[PDB]
Design a protein around this ligand. Structure first.
Ligand code: APC
Ligand code: X6L
Ligand code: MG
Ligand code: MG
Length: 159
């Protein structure tokens, strides 16, 4: 039995589009993960620390038989495969893979919160997520993504 989950991907170092497309390929290669939907890519001004490069961001849907922790380990392993060496949470990275949603399940462990607890105020997440998951309910707010998404000029259609 598979569950539907959503991942947020980001890159702001180097050939960002290549790193994102390699990430999707690698995610689809883990036993127990199948990438089932892919959003458009957006180019986005960096949020937080601004003296760093512009990001490309997208979202994917996966069908997975993995538990949430097994899925997290696959996300981190993918970052390692793309040579994410920097680990300053505020700083640049070759690849970031974040778990956004895992069905309607909710957890807030010290080091793992799903739904991702910052997604609802990030246009760099909600805009691509709405492209693939408009009618999906975000279980904290209990609102559909299409009712969370908002306009943001710092998020531009890329490609
Ligand atoms: N839903 C989630 N997805 C991925 N990582 C999560 C997570 N909730 C908590 N984390 C934690 O965040 C840790 C550090 O990961 P980083 O990728 O450097 C943070 P970031 O992606 O820059 O910020 P963000 O998670 O606010 O987007 C992970 O090892 C994990 O323990
Ligand atoms: N557009 C864009 N900006 C990004 N900044 C980063 S650094 C980690 C982070 O998410 C982050 C996001 C937001 C704050 C913040 C912190 C405090 C106050 C306001 C914002 C910090 C870090 N990742 C991306 C990305 O993927 N896209
Ligand atoms: Mg992140
Ligand atoms: Mg991350």
């Amino acid at each position: 039995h598979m569950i539907q989950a959503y991942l947020g991907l980001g890159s702001n170092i180097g050939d960002r589009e290549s790193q994102l497309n390699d990430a999707i390929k690698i995610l689809n290669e883990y036993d127990g993960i199948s990438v089932s939907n892919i959003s458009p890519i957006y180019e986005t001004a960096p949020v937080g620390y601004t003296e760093q490069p512009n990001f490309l961001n997208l979202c994917v849907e996966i069908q997975t038989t993995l538990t949430v922790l097994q899925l997290l380990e696959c996300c981190l392993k993918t970052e390692e495969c793309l040579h994410r060496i920097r680990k300053e949470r505020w700083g640049p990275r070759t690849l970031d893979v974040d778990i956004l949603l895992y069905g309607e399940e909710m957890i807030d462990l010290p080091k793992l919160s799903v739904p991702h607890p910052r997604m609802n105020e990030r246009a760099f997440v909600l805009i691509p997520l709405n492209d693939i998951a408009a009618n999906v309910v975000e279980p904290r707010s209990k609102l559909k993504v299409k009712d969370l998404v908002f306009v943001d000029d710092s998020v531009k259609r890329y490609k």
